Every structure is written in structure tokens, then in C-alpha cells.
Amino acid sequence: MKAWVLKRLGGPLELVDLPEPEAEEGEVVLRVEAVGLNFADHLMRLGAYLTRLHPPFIPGMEVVGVVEGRRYAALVPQGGLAERVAVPKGALLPLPEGLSPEEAAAFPVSFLTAYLALKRAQARPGEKVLVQAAAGALGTAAVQVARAMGLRVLAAASRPEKLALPLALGAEEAATYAEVPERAKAWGGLDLVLEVRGKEVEESLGLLAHGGRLVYIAPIPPLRLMRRNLAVLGFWLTPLLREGALVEEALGFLLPRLGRELRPVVGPVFPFAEAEAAFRALLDRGHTGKVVVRL
């Protein structure tokens, strides 16, 4: 089969022929239709991610494909950018009839991240939440999920031209980063902040109201947190996938809404042949939505 392999960290990808995947006991081989790319994939190629994969390896962790006539979505540790991938039956995610392969590929990581992040910060109906990079994959997903949870959303992005989408998705207000401080004050401070910028985190903390919580998805002075009983929660999706209880709960909330009130935003779609281009699109702040590779 054809597949993209990264032989060296920081190196280029290579289109190669590889042996067909062999499904071990409990696994199925799904023929890939689409692959959703994540910034995490970019960091893994540089060896700068929480998980350190040793080359050579096939990039791609968010896959959508067919198994015996039925389409499923799945999170794999690697092997995405290939014609076929072996996947544990238990990781298979059933999709609603009619969901396109592209929209399905933009769902797993973003929506699970948004929901589990808010769920962990104990977001309650009516609470005020700031969503950054609100026109991106995670952002658009965050706005929709927060809305479904009954939260009041303040979306922020870098350029005015990126604000229409988040506003359309349900945000109460959308603002450029420069104006967030004044909006937070106008809102009486925020209850939650989904931090993806990571730079001046101390500034994000200043936007929080008493009891506020920042989810970290430039050190933090432990004293600014006391005055207002603030909390900073570090977040990393991968380890959470191993917790059946959490997952089941999240899927019990997300799945019945997939294709209905929750509609993953597909961004640039690249053909299999343009894998390198798709990876660069992950770096183009200008793109909106999820970067997807279609086979």
C-alpha cells in the first residue's frame, strides 16, 4: 500500500509502498478515506510533542474509514496517512448516517478536547467562557460544545475577518485579542478560559472573575491565583483516552449531537498526494477550521 513515512525528525515526508497492515487479535483493518491533521502532528515531526514517536513512522492520528461496509472514525497513535490502518475494535467510533468523511475527520480530537476540557473545569450552565483561536479547528469546536453545554461564549481571534464564523457558531460576542481585555471587563470577568495561545498566560488570568478557571491546552505567579481563588488546569487529551468512564460520558453527550447541533468545521482539504502542503497549512494562521487530507 501507499503511505507517507517520516524517516527523520525535522525531515521531509516520503511517499512509499509498504506491506498491508495485519490485524492482530481484536483489531480490524480500516481502509482510510480521510485524515484530520493537528498541530500535535506538526510537533511530533519535530520531536517537540508530549508523546515522542521514534522514526520511522507514518504521521496521522485522526482517521476516518471503512470496515466491512461501515464507516468509523478513530484515534490511532500513528499510521494515519496510509491506505489502510490496523485499529483496535474498541477505539472505533460509530458515525451518523450521511456524515461526510471530511466532517467526521474534523471531529474526534477537537470535540473531545473541548468537552473534556470544559467538563474538567466543571463548566456550569450560564457560565462565561473565553475561546481563543475561535476560527480554528479546536476553537470552532469549542464554541459549539460550550453552547450545547449552555455556556456564554466570548470568542477571540487575531484578525477581524476571523470573527464572523465564531459569532455565527453561537458566540455572544467575538473580538480580536487586543480588545479581549475590555470585553472581559464588560462581561464582569470570565468564569473559564480555554488557553491555546499560551504566551502571556498571566494576562489571561487577569480576565477571570472569582472562582475562575483557566484550562491550559511564561511562568504563572502563585499568588495571583489566591486573591480570586483561581485555578489553572493543565490539559492533555491522550492519557484521558485510556479512561473508559470519561470517554463513554463524553461520547454519550457528543455523539447524539454530531451532525445536528454539533457540526465540525472542515477547512482546507488536501488530496493524499499533497500531504506536505497540508502539514504547512497547519502553520498558516490564515486557514480556518480543520486541515483534512482526503484519499
Kindly report the CATH number assigned to the domain that includes residue 272: 3.90.180.10
- Which residues are within 8 A (CB) of 255 and not within 5 positions of it... i.e. 6 or more apart? 94, 96
Q: What is the DSSP letter of 10?
A: T
Q: Are 143 and 190 members of one domain?
A: yes
Classified as helix, coil or strand, 5 is strand
Q: Are 281 and 219 members of one domain?
A: no
Q: Are 105 and 18 members of one domain?
A: yes
What residues pair up with 174 in beta bridges, in sequence order?
Answer: 155
Terminus-to-terminus CA distance in the chain, angstroms? Answer: 13
Q: What is the spatial distance between Cα 28 and Cα 160, in angstroms, rounded to a whole number? A: 45
**Resolution for this experimental structure (Å):** 2.3
Q: Are 81 and 134 members of one domain?
A: no
CATH classification at residue 139: 3.40.50.720
What's the domain range around 8? 2-109+264-295
Phi, psi of 198 (to 5 degrees): 70, -15
Phi-psi domain of 209 (left: phi exceeds 0; alpha: psi -120 through 50; beta: other)? beta
Classified as helix, coil or strand, 41 is helix
Classified as helix, coil or strand, 212 is strand
> 162: annotated binding-site residue?
yes
Strands of 128-131's sheet in order across: 173-176, 152-157, 128-131, 190-195, 208-216, 231-234
Q: What is the spatial distance between Cα 263 and Cα 266, in angstroms, rounded to a whole number? A: 9
Q: Are 268 and 192 members of one domain?
A: no
Q: Are 272 and 225 members of one domain?
A: no
Strands 290-294 and 266-271: parallel
Q: Are 117 and 96 members of one domain?
A: no
How many domains would you assign to the chain? 2
Q: Are 115 and 259 members of one domain?
A: yes
Contact predicate 129/118, CB 8 Å: yes
Q: Are 213 and 227 members of one domain?
A: yes
Contact predicate 198/173, CB 8 Å: no
> Breaks in the chain, named by the residue before each, with C–N above 2.5 Å?
217
> 237: annotated binding-site residue?
yes
Q: Are 268 and 199 members of one domain?
A: no
Q: Determined by which method?
A: X-ray
CB atoms within 10 A of CB 114: 28
Phi-psi domain of 23 (left: phi exceeds 0; alpha: psi -120 through 50; beta: other)? beta
> 290: annotated binding-site residue?
no
> 235: annotated binding-site residue?
yes
Q: Are 123 and 259 members of one domain?
A: yes
Contact predicate 121/115, CB 8 Å: no
Q: Are 216 and 281 members of one domain?
A: no
Cell, residue 222: 502563585
Classified as helix, coil or strand, 238 is helix
Q: What is the spatial distance between Cα 38 and Cα 238, in angstroms, rounded to a whole number? A: 13
> 177: annotated binding-site residue?
yes
Question: Looking at the chain, which runs of residues are DSSP E strands?
Answer: 2-6, 13-17, 27-37, 62-67, 70-75, 84-88, 93-94, 128-131, 152-157, 173-176, 190-195, 208-216, 231-234, 266-271, 290-294
